[PDB]
Every structure is written in C-alpha cells, then in structure tokens.
C-alpha cells in the first residue's frame, strides 16, 4: 500500500540503473554505483 509510487516499487533503490551494462537491476550510491547483486560479486572473486 504505497502513497504515490510513480516508478518501480522498492525502498532506497535509487534513480540511476546499475553501473554494469549487462544488469537489469538498479544501482545504489552506497554500492559505488553497482547494485545489491553486483556489489556482492565485486568483492567476491569471479571466474570465467
């Protein structure tokens, strides 16, 4: 039950999309641009 949401539902999601290009989710200023998902990977080691 939102008051008047124009865009997409969420709390402290952000206005700009995730820094990454191949990412549908949105990004955040706290995650240095990246989104919740990426933000995690950023720290964790990636392979392939």
Quote the CA–CA distance of 48 and 29 in Å, as a whole number.
28
Determine the length of the chain: 48
Question: Would you say 39 is a known binding-site residue?
Answer: no
Q: Does 38 bind Zn ion (CB under 5 A)?
A: yes
Q: Which of 13, 14, 17, 23 binds Zn ion (CB under 5 A)?
A: 23
Q: Which is nearer to Zn ion, 14 or 20 (CB)?
A: 20
Residue 26 is given by DSSP the state B
Q: Which of 20, 31, 33, 42 binds Zn ion (CB under 5 A)?
A: 20
Q: Are 35 and 15 in contact (CB under 8 A)?
A: no
Binding site for Zn ion (CB under 5 A): 18, 20, 23, 35, 38
């Amino acid at each position: 039950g939102s008051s008047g949401s124009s865009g997409t539902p969420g709390d402290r999601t952000g206005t700009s999309k995730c820094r990454k290009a191949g990412c549908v989710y949105f990004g955040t200023p706290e995650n240095k641009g990246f989104c919740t998902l990426c933000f995690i990977e950023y720290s964790g080691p990636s392979s392939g």
